[PDB]
């Protein structure tokens with residue numbers, strides 16, 4: 001044992017409970033380094049001497065930043081294979097999803113209500129939604145990843161046409177984050193937004209923002225390819241000094257002792273099949289998740305960035 005060093009983009013309080021439980025079960029000391037927007041630079045600068053064991057981050061774009069900075073090592077683990085569905089881990093064994101986040105469509109509770117069953121992201125590009133849609137910058141990773149999935153499913157031409165239609169329907173210049181779009185729904189600026197599911201929980205947890213969530217309905221797209229999921233996950237650092245402990249830790253985080261808790265704390269979904277979401281998350285509804293591999297989203301990420309620039313999505 002001795003220890004394991006977790007460099008985390010995610011705030012320590014959102015990961016500490018499961019790490020404390022791991023410590024109790026194994027006797028392995030878990031050190032948390034809050035690398036924040038750090039994280040690649042810090043580990044790269046620390047180089048061969050870096051104590052980093054587990055790199056914990058959020059969004060496939062950040063996972064790819066780590067992999068593409070040559071900071072990952074390949075891990076062969078039957079536990080990770082069994083616990084994590086293949087779509088939420090690397091076929092090339094360098095990264096592993098631990099939770100998912102759904103990119104959903106929020107609607108005005110009063111002015112729209114629940115979306116009809118069958119509603120797709122694609123429907124937001126239809127002319128009837130002109131002036132009614134709020135989305136943050138198209139270059140934001142949450143959106144680029146969604147568009148990358150669309151490239152996989154539909155190709156660049158159809159995705160480009162979608163982006164053009166979506167742009168045409170925006171109520172305002174893309175601005176702010178996902179929560180800001182729901183604030184805009186609350187204030188009647190728009191009736192539809194795209195945003196991550198977990199924000200609904202985060203807003204309800206906040207005294208000011210709860211009214212934003214209360215004015216909106218969370219809708220899980222239910223077209224052909226269902227609801228887009230992105231991930232939080234982990235990578236074992238290239239120069240991990242406590243590799244065995246590190247692998248033990250991520251195996252633990254992938255399993256039934258940690259999955260429910262970790263997802264619950266973050267209002268996310270567990271990756272491990274059979275683990276329930278929290279009561280609050282479950283209450284938002286059940287839905288079909290896209291089966292697309294996150295590595296295929298990563299593959300199309302650059303093309304999606306290119307398409308966003310081509311259509312000048314943020315230009316109003």
Ligand SMILES: [Fe+3]
Nearest residue numbers: 178196198199
């Ligand atoms: Fe977020």
